[PDB]
Amino acid sequence: EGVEPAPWAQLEAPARLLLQALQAGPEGARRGLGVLRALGSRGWEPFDWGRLLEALCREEPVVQGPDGRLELKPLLLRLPRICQRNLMSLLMAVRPSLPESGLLSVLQI
Amino acid sequence: MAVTEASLLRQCPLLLPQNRSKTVYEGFISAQGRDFHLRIVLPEDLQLKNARLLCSWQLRTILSGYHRIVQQRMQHSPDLMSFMMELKMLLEVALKNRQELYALPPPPQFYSSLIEEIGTLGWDKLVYADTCFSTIKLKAEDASGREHLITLKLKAKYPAESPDYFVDFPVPFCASWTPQSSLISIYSQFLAAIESLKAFWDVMDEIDEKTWVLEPEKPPRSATARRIALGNNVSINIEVDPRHPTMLPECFFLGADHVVKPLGIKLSRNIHLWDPENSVLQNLKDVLEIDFPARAILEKSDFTMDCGICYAYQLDGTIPDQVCDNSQCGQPFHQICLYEWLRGLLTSRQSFNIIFGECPYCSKPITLKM
Amino acid sequence: PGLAPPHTRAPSPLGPTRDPVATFLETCRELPPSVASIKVSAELLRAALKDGHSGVPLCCATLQWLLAENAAVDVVRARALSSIQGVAPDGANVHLIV
Amino acid sequence: MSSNEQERLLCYNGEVLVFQLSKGNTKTPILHVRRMVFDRGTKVFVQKSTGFFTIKEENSHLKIMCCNCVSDFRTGINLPYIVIEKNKKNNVFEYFLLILHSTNKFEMRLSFKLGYEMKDGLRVLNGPLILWRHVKAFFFISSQTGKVVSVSGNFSSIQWAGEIENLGMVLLGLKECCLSEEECTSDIYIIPPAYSSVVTYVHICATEILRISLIALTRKNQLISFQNGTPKNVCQLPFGDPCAVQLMDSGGGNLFFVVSFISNNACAVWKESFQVAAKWEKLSLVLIDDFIGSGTEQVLLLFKDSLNSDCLTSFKITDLGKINYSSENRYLVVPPLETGLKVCFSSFRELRQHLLLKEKIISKSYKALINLVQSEQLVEKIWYRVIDDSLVVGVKTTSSLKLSLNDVTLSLLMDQAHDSRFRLLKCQNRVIKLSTNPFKKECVQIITAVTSLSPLLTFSKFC
Amino acid sequence: APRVRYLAGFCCPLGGLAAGKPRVLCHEAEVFLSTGSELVYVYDQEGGLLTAAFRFPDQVWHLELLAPRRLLYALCARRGLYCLSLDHPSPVIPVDPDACILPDAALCAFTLLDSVLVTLVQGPARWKMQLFEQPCPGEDPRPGGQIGEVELSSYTPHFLPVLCSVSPSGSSGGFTLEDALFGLLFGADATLLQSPVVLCGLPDGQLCCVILKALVTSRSAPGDPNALVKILHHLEEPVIFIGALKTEPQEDVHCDCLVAFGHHGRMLAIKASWDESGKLVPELREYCLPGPVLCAACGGGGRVYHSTPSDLCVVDLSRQPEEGPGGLPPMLCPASLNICSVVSTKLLALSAKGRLMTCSLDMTTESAGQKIKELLSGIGNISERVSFLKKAVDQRNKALTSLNEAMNVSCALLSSGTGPRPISCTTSTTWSRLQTQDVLMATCVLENSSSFSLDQGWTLCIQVLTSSCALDLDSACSAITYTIPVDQLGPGARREVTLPLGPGENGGLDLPVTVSCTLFYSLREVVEQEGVCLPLSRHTVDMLQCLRF
Ligand SMILES: [Zn+2]
Ligand SMILES: [Zn+2]
């Protein structure tokens, strides 16, 4: 009935860890940088932002408003509200090394 | 139209009502140039609270997962027309997600043109191609003799729309695509962007050679930061600007409060002596008025012994004690950070004073005893 | 048919396709608008035209006199358009201006 | 080709036989079989076995002609045959038939010794049965019988020949006439004598009850089907002077027709859309068999002897699909292409199935339309006559329809497919009662309509 | 590495070989073949030359073999049942009727178990199973005296029936099931007697089993059908193959799965569950493969090689239980009917062109450039057909949309809108002048109110009945009828037709005149013989419309 899986469940594990990390309140943002350096450290030294920025726009269905209304929300609006504000904070922090087409799709959301 | 007399014809043309009393529809339903079988049954009256809806196995595998939504929509939707509008939308979404399994390119243009174009580039270039032929990756060289890769991802219609270009280097790469352009065009733009950033590269190459770079270990080509170690148990981290590498960097100090302070003072005094005509090292050495060690310890670097959740040593008296049972991770944690993490995950299960869960970094069984 | 009084939806005739004997011959064996005009002196046409009616001086009454025998002349007498479009007896269209 | 030095080829069970009369030195020319097979590694034909057969005399004018696979009637085994002609320059011609066995040994069956050289559609048929003609007289010599026979009937050409079911052996020479070759001499649902004027070659496909479905092709370089005398799905051919058609199967559902021409060229048309998928020019020979080992037929094309003085070189083997053979890193791209082939093929097979599904749904919904508006035969049967310039159509009723209680009418409705234009069409209706031997006793009510013809014979035809 | 070899060839009638009848069996290194003819062949499989051929009279309909006794049993069609020693001291050899054993001359099918020769013989309408001894010691190969018979009362009649032995484990050409399944299907009796069971699929479709130990009868003790023969499942369609499979593979294989197969492609599989209640339950599945199926066999591990008319396809059951849908890839071989499957997978088949073939299933330089070339040529070849089929689909689609409009119009006209306004047609009487006489004309206006466009396929039929009373003497015109093609019409538009009603003879019109319009829709035009008519309306002229003052 009320079990909800985490909406980042289906992503490449590194992204899952990043988004898990940002969840943890206002010191959530800082942690993200430690996560990115702690994946520069591991076997996959580059981090494939283009895939996370695709996956952040992908849509799934939700039922909000009255009781019944089918709507399509991208990921960025569906994951927890402190993760949103600390994601966009960490993109503000690392803008230069991001592909613009993806970034723009996110801002479009 | 508004009423379900011409609107239903116009919005689901391949649904044919079998019965005179329009109660059983059968036929096809359209989505992204693909028709799916569908057969619907109403009661004696026009209520969808109870109705049959059968589909082909094509359609069920694609409406896998959304089964509960559709089931819900059957009960919640007022009219049949709106239920079909919603199910076509929904179907579009389920297809756009698993776009991997569902596609077909137009060969006569595609496969031949791409192979002609890779011949126009030169087969010295190509290094990788995906079985779906969607992703390909090419190589180029610097005049300095550095390899830089470029990933493209191609659509069903390659020459029509832009292909998504992914590249490592830290300034944003801009590729003027035309419908007339091809792989040679974007590749020439890529070589131009490479030759632009040469100077930044020279800087980082000289640094990674003549100094103990520490924590971008085996650094990427995107990386602007270089935590340099100096003396012992103190470091200076250094971020460099790509447009102006030779220009003064952002630098500050981690380590012992008593050792760093005189260094900050000496820096303050010498910062006017910075000169962007020499090298970064040749400027820093006379600015901070000290020399570096050339790899004082190569074996026992500062293996990060911090929580790997909170990234601190000394969390509330506690030490990084709880560790990973893994040779490849070996990552310490804290009781508190690792308890609040494991109590979150859905996989974890708690015995009396024990929680078993996955190590955050490597996702291996880790045990925590409170 | 277009300028007609009723303005009612009549199907366009589109006379028979080349010949039913032509069809026979195809099966068994398997552009600008052309214009013509005249000019004439207003003095001649005036002494030649009306004497009759109101007669807006030349353009409309000239066409009324040109179509005095046509059944749909009274309409153009009313509407006073000095120019007209219609269909043929054989099916082609014809527009006649003065 | 037909000479001493010169060869003839043949395809027998996924391999290729090369018969050559090698004029050998002590000896008269020897019949040689090479038996050659396709490696798939080396992309050549390699010799897998040989066989020879000495003909007994030091007499010239040996000649190969006529060779295919037949089915011997003793066993039921197909085997290669070969017809020698033997001329001693005596104005006497022998005409051997040799049949070659799995063992690479030969077995004569007929000697047959005629006087005049033959020059016409020589044509071997199942129960090893030679069959030829001179001046519009057909003759045949079975191997079972052994004795020469003349055909009682009289025919010009012999368009088709072979075992139709239950009729033993048969000939189609005039498209009415359909002989037996046991009791010399149904012609009702064979192709029309209208087409009989242009038909040059026929090839039957299937038989029910009779009713045969049949392809043909004609002098106007056409290619036509028939299903019980119903010229469906005509095609058209680029080149001229067609000789023969073969059939090719190639795979799941694909059918081709390989059509050969006099001008040393040939084409392939893809059944399901009588079109042209390929055309070739050149061509010493064409053969159709499974050469590859893939379990589907292919087509082997031999290119002209201009290239080399050696045979079975300069070939090409082609399903007209995945299989195609013929006579700087690059390796990473390939498996993407190989997967691209297999996705394409699967997409093909899925479209076909999808299409069937669409037709099944259209049918279903016709029947649903029909049943939505709505058992006892209210009407016997229909008939029509033309009187002079009037068409009259009439229909004979049954007991259930009582003209006391029901005014009935009738109408005729033209197919708008023909009528690009719309006239009206008018019909007057009479009822006709006739008493049948009043001198219970049957009355006969029939109901009839009359109309003009000439308004409806615009298109030579109507329905 | 040629995956298919061709071994020898046989005489094939036009339209392909017959389904059902021809059969191929293989011994260690021999292969025995019948092609639905008077002949039966034996091929040494090393070099696929024929050792020996056997001319029987009349059409061998089924074969079997015994390895230990080294015998070969065959069924001649209208004659009985022959036997042949494989040593058997031209290569063709005709059989003397000395070899005939039990010439029952009405027997349609037969099979063998260890020491028994279950047969099945068409009587009159009701077919009857029989059961014989067969003498275990090497003697004169005899039947012996009939142990038992039965009457398959359910069967009341081209397609021969089929038989299968299903002995259980612990107790033979057949299939040995596993005990849990055996117990599910044949019950305690069969389990306890450890009795072989015989499944007969009949051309009727229904598939009946009979227990052998239970089948002992005599003239003092006749076999009772309603007790002794029972019926698993009623396939609607004829039966082609029954087998058993080892699903969960995780010679004497204790099979687990039961397979039946329709002509038209209803496959049916059964397996044992013991699920959900702590009780043994049966797993039914009626799958539905495409095609007319022509033959079937069974290969290692739940794979079922069948042969539609297009190609030799293949289905896997091997892994809830068995399979939710059956999805079934071809293997790119022709319509082989008569398939046989020996395990090592290397199967033997006869191609419907009539060929015997042994299907054995499973970088460089600038020559790589030639490889590239071949693949590119290939894709270009295929694409042009995929092209063609898309266009086909577009036409059939167009059809459906059209048809849809038709069905919507149809439904609107029969419905009662309470206002007849999908399509309307007024008529109106007037008077004209012809040569000398006044004529009376009916204008028939067709008006489209609703949105629906009557595109091609619709046609108006008006019918003018001069009066409704039938006399002693049939008039020269009870009614005239006219018909016009309606084309596209479109929405809101209107078409008009004028008709004479008025005196062409005598100057005499009797009034009431009834002018009736209807519409006919023709299925064919957009692409029992059919259409539909629909009743627009019926105007009466009652003298009062024919006055002029
Ligand atoms: Zn911690
Ligand atoms: Zn770990």
SS3 track for B125-161: CEEEECCCCCEEEEEEECCCCCEEEEEEECCCCCCCC
Tokens linked to C66: 């040109």
Q: Answer yes or no: are the C-beta atoms of E35 and E47 closer than 8 Å.
A: no
Beta bridge partners of D259: D245, D267
CA distance E537 to chain C (A): 22
CA distance A32 to A23: 10
Tokens linked to B134: 């969607």
Contacts of A1 (CB under 8 A, 6+ apart): none
Nearest to D194 by CA among D224, D164, D153: D224
CA distance D336 to B129: 7
Nearest to A38 by CA among A50, A56, A21: A21
CA distance B219 to chain D (A): 28
Give residue B321 CA to ligand 1 midpoint distance, Å.
Answer: 9
CA distance B46 to B288: 84
Distances from the Cα of B364 to the Cα of A37, B321, B329, B357, angstroms = 21, 17, 10, 8
CA distance E47 to E32: 14
Q: Answer yes or no: are the C-beta atoms of E407 and D369 closer than 8 Å.
A: yes
Q: Which chains does chain B touch, 3 or more C-beta pairs < 8 A?
A: A, D, E
CA distance C17 to chain D (A): 8
Distances from the Cα of E302 to the Cα of E31, E250, E297, E452, angstroms = 24, 12, 11, 55
Residue type, B78: P
Residue with tokens 């090719």: D248
Exposure of B46 in the CB half-sphere (CA atoms within 13 A):
9
Exposure of E160 in the CB half-sphere (CA atoms within 13 A):
29
CA distance E75 to E62: 6
3-state secondary structure of D408: coil
Beta carbons within 10 angstroms of residue D406's beta carbon: 10
- List, as one string, the DSSP characters of C9-67: -PPP----SS-HHHHHHHHHH--PPP-------HHHHHHHS-SSS---TTHHHHHHHHT
User: Positive or negative, the Cα torsion across E462, E464, E469, E472?
Assistant: negative
Beta bridge partners of E259: E243, E269
Residues of B whose CB is below 8 A from A5 = 346
Spell out the alpha helix ranges (H) of chain B. Answer: 7-11, 57-62, 67-76, 80-97, 110-121, 183-210, 257-270, 280-287, 335-342
Indicate the Cα dihedral angle E530, E536, E542, E546, nearest 10°. -100
Beta bridge partners of D236: D222
Beta carbons within 10 angstroms of residue E158's beta carbon: 9
Residues annotated within the binding site of B for Zn(2+) are 307, 310, 324, 329, 334, 337, 359, 362
Strand E162-165 to D379-386 pairing: unpaired
CA distance B41 to D393: 45
Contacts of D434 (CB under 8 A, 6+ apart): D443, D444
Distances from the Cα of E549 to the Cα of B44, E431, E442, E506, E546, angstroms = 57, 12, 18, 22, 10
Residue type, D156: S
User: Do D373 and E475 lie within an 8 Å CB cutoff?
Assistant: no
Residue of B nearest to A99 (CA): B172
CA distance B19 to B22: 5
Q: Answer yes or no: are the C-beta atoms of D75 and E92 closer than 8 Å.
A: yes
CA distance A54 to A75: 10
- Measured between its terminal Cα atoms, the distance across chain E in Å is 101
Residues of B whose CB is below 8 A from D372 = 18-20
CB-neighbour burial class of residue D259 (10 A; exposed 0-12, middle 13-18, buried 19+): buried
Tokens linked to B107: 């060969």
Contacts of D329 (CB under 8 A, 6+ apart): B123, B124, B126
CA distance E262 to E202: 11
Beta carbons within 10 angstroms of residue E409's beta carbon: 20
Residues of B whose CB is below 8 A from A63 = 69, 72
Contacts of B67 (CB under 8 A, 6+ apart): none
Contacts of D147 (CB under 8 A, 6+ apart): D141
Q: Answer yes or no: are the C-beta atoms of D112 and D130 closer than 8 Å.
A: yes
Residues of D whose CB is below 8 A from E333 = 295-296
Tokens linked to A14: 């590194």
- The alpha carbon of A60 is separated from its chain's Cα centroid by a whole number of angstroms, namely 15
Residues of D whose CB is below 8 A from B105 = 340
CA distance D21 to D26: 15
Q: What is the largest CA-CA distance in chain D?
A: 104
User: Do D362 and E383 lie within an 8 Å CB cutoff?
Assistant: no
Exposure of B3 in the CB half-sphere (CA atoms within 13 A):
4
Residue of D nearest to B37 (CA): D357
CA distance B142 to E493: 73
Q: Answer yes or no: are the C-beta atoms of D20 and D35 closer than 8 Å.
A: no
Q: Answer yes or no: are the C-beta atoms of B151 and A99 closer than 8 Å.
A: no
User: Do B108 and E383 lie within an 8 Å CB cutoff?
Assistant: yes
Q: Please, what is the Cα angle at B355 between B351 and B359, to 5 degrees? A: 155
CA distance B15 to B9: 8
Interchain CB contacts (distance < 8 Å): C and E: 9
**Torsions phi, psi of E433, nearest 5?**
-140, 130
Tokens linked to E404: 């849809």
Residue with tokens 């064996």: C29
Spell out the alpha helix ranges (H) of E437-528. Answer: none
Contacts of A107 (CB under 8 A, 6+ apart): none
3-state secondary structure of C69: coil
Q: Which chains does chain E touch, 3 or more C-beta pairs < 8 A?
A: B, C, D
Beta carbons within 10 angstroms of residue D438's beta carbon: 9
CA distance E53 to E93: 6
DSSP state of B278: S
Q: How was this structure determined?
A: cryo-EM
Beta carbons within 10 angstroms of residue B184's beta carbon: 14
Tokens linked to E137: 């010691």
Nearest to E511 by CA among E475, E478, E467, E471: E467
User: Which helix (H) or strand (E) segment is E146 a member of?
Assistant: strand E146-149
Q: What is the length of chain D?
A: 463
DSSP state of A76: G
Tokens linked to E27: 């011994």
Give residue B337 CA to ligand 1 midpoint distance, Å.
Answer: 5
CA distance D357 to A101: 42
Tokens linked to D9: 């080829």
Contacts of B191 (CB under 8 A, 6+ apart): B140
Q: Answer yes or no: are the C-beta atoms of D71 and D99 closer than 8 Å.
A: no
- Measured between its terminal Cα atoms, the distance across chain A in Å is 30
- Measured between its terminal Cα atoms, the distance across chain B in Å is 66
Helix B183-210 to helix B110-121 angle, to the nearest 10 degrees?
A: 50
Tokens linked to B291: 């020399």
Q: Answer yes or no: are the C-beta atoms of E507 and E437 closer than 8 Å.
A: yes
- Pick the residue of D222, D458, D460 with the most C CBs within 10 A to test the interface with C by mutation: D458
User: Which helix (H) or strand (E) segment is A15 a member of?
Assistant: helix A13-22
**Torsions phi, psi of D457, nearest 5?**
-100, 40
User: Do B14 and E403 lie within an 8 Å CB cutoff?
Assistant: no
DSSP state of D114: B
Q: Answer yes or no: are the C-beta atoms of D110 and D95 closer than 8 Å.
A: yes
Beta bridge partners of E209: E199, E230
Beta bridge partners of E516: E463, E538
User: Do B19 and D372 lie within an 8 Å CB cutoff?
Assistant: yes
Q: Answer yes or no: are the C-beta atoms of E406 and D366 closer than 8 Å.
A: no
Nearest to C20 by CA among D415, D456, D414, D425: D456
The order of strands in the sheet holding E423-429 is E423-429, E441-448, E494-500
User: Which helix (H) or strand (E) segment is D111 a member of?
Assistant: none
Nearest to E348 by CA among E10, E63, E60, E31: E31
**Torsions phi, psi of A87, nearest 5?**
-55, -60
Rg of chain B in Å (alpha carbons): 31
CA distance E179 to E168: 7
CA distance B233 to B256: 7
Distances from the Cα of A103 to the Cα of A106, B35, B164, C14, E419, angstroms = 5, 34, 13, 61, 59
CA distance B140 to B158: 22
CA distance E115 to E172: 9
CA distance D52 to D32: 5
Give residue B313 CA to ligand 1 midpoint distance, Å.
Answer: 7
CA distance E373 to E367: 10
CA distance E373 to E366: 11
Distances from the Cα of D327 to the Cα of C59, D300, D343, angstroms = 84, 12, 27
CA distance E190 to E211: 7
Residue type, C77: R
Exposure of D279 in the CB half-sphere (CA atoms within 13 A):
10
Tokens linked to E477: 């015109």
- List, as one string, the DSSP characters of E106-129: -EEEE--BTTB--EEE--SSS-EE
- Assign 3-class secondary structure to E316-379: ECCCCCCCCCCCCCECCCCCEEEEEEECCCEEEEEECCCEEEEEECCCCCCHHHHHHHHHHHHH
Contacts of E314 (CB under 8 A, 6+ apart): E303, E304, E305, E306, E328, E329, E330, E331
CA distance B221 to B144: 14
